[PDB]
Amino acid sequence: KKPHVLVIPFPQSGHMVPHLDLTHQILLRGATVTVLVTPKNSSYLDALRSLHSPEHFKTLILPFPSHPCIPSGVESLQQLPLEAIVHMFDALSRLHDPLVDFLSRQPPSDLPDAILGSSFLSPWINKVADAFSIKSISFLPINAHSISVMWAQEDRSFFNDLETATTESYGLVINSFYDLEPEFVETVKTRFLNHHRIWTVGPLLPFKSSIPPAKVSAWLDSCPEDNSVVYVGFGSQIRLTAEQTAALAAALEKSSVRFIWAVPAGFEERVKEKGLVIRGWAPQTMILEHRAVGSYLTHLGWGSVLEGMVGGVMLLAWPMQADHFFNTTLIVDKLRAAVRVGENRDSVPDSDKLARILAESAREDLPERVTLMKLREKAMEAIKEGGSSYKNLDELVAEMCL
Template sequence: MENNKNEKPHVLVIPFPQSGHMLPHLDLTHQLLFRGAVVTVVVTPNNSTYVDPLRRLHSPENLRTLILPFPSHPLIPSGVESLQQLPLQALPHMLEALSGLRDPLSDWLRRQPPSDLPAAIVGSSFLSPWINKLADEFSLKSICFLPINAHSVATMWAQEDRGFFDDLESATTASYGLVVNSFYELETQYVETVKAKFMTHHRVWTVGPLLPVNSGVDRGGRSSVPSEKVTAWLDSSGENSVVYVGFGSQIRLTKQQTAALAAALERSGVRFIWAVRDAAKKISGDSQDADAGEDVIPAGFEERVAGKGLVIRGWAPQSMILNHRAVGSYLTHLGWGSVLEGLVGGVVLLAWPMQADHFYNTKLLVDELRAAVRAGENRESVPDPEELARVLVESVKEDLPERLEFMKLREKGLNAIKEGGSSYNNLDDLVRETTL
């Protein structure tokens, strides 16, 4: 899709500061830039580095960064600007704080010359209550981005009691359109349900799986193991022989869960990489016990599994790991971003759902599509080490039925993002809509 210089649409992108939201939103931004849009990304100072991979690939003329101070909040510690630094119950406080960006953005938009005013805001659905008002103030199109799938959207919005999420749903359904990181062939029925029952118009764009921006710049933070060492370790492993264990940026296991998982890995004898998160910062009134904020590896575990297992503390190069030929399965909370990374990598998903949309994703992939394996129950459950060890051993087998079903979905997903595919065409249409 080509645009003359004077016809380039200008889009304002406002992501939610949590890596599971921020990263796919910036992957979407890359696709908008690829299609000729000029994009201004709004971030706070500590989140500016997330944009570095895009800065490596796109000129400052087309990719602009608007850095605004993080609004202070009495219940958010100074220096914290991302939800993954906090326990999940801090989400309402984070949303309250981020609403303080509206006035600075309004001032910025007021100062823009008419020729350079954005035509649309592609903002996080989590921020839609005030983004919609900002868009109305300047007669812009407000388009919501959700990093989850249509099945989860349709399920959550059909529930009667959603607490403060009611405001988010109302604002999202009132927006000009909705962008979903999924592909039409995966969940046609649910996409159509969202259009007909909730959005009441056709502007629901499935654009996934959004591939990670490949610029040679790491997308994460500090890590205890350099990426090149991880690659070398995987290179020394047989094909589909390694289990990757990771629970995203928000989940941290209790001491009991960590001990059970460690015992299962040790007893199974499988090769593995285990990504362990840093502790979250406490918030005022946080009642979590002292062990609930971090994964505590049992003493002596790493020495006992030396040569068989690799423990990575902090950030792990997850996309690279999942795309390596040696990785055969992925023990995951089944957050949607992780599902899509596993899909692109072609690994078996072992589902241990913890919260929010994880349970809906498990229902879709395990119960409906038979394309993933249930390995855990919920955030409170402690798995039986013997049973989990059995699941881990089975998961690296080539003829596992769930592997065969998941590979069929993978083919559909990769076809969707090829030129002429459903997601590729929807991205073209999304950029086209911002110029109408």
């Protein structure tokens, strides 16, 4: 017996991509899933659709409910400011009625053994699940340390409903692995889940612009030295000031390392044929996995951490939004597996106390790199057969059958 699972992801890519990586994981273990999405997000499901038949994999596209504080044709958080997350909560809560009407029509046999939807949508998903007495398992792309700090806040702002709803769900799946933060998985399991089901499942991995992906790799292979090129790649929303962009640009120039800057700049695109600046979509996972890339200058969002860990690079941390600081606390301060180069959203670095940092960052001797590599070895063990994430994938799938 294998379960049918209604997957309801959150339309921001930090959530969507691991949530679809986990659905792929589920489908490999024999489940059949249907994915509910909004129309402008149907393209996201193209990879999945190419890999499993309509027999096992199904789309349920519902119209995006309107809301006057979201501009039209905007159905995902990549396109609007960090405040409007509350507006996207309000809009997608109005898929409640369309979703109950869809499930009420199915033959009761066809109804899902479980819903595996975002923890962010749990306030209404849990009501849908209860109505049909279905398992409601939540998902998070953030780690247990972050969940720990967030759930403990006495003022959880407008995350109060979804955090409360997540604590009330059947259980919670997260994109981390146990040996990375076991204290924090255990706090979450005991302190913030009413039942006590947490599945660490990470690192969830892909199952795979101005310059094409085939040409960046030719430039990477042009690099003679292994472990010798620094990738600077900042993820949305926050863009840098003209002053911050100019500071980092002088750091990369004066540093005279080879670099790839994925993005004002100035004179400097043609100045240094040691650096390559790409505008738009960047083959990120491909860059960090190349032997020539030895450090990664990032805000230290969680997906960035696991990409850099799994790719085995020095993480240079410049946190600016809350999750970035939790991860700095974890990866830099507590684990000494990364180096801090920026303080916060308004910092302006000095051009060669950072260029010094960069030109010495890819070097394999420094303790942060050696700690990060031991963590990478732990991360590999978790997803291989026998590892805790693998087993938690097996156990989660048998659990949804209950």
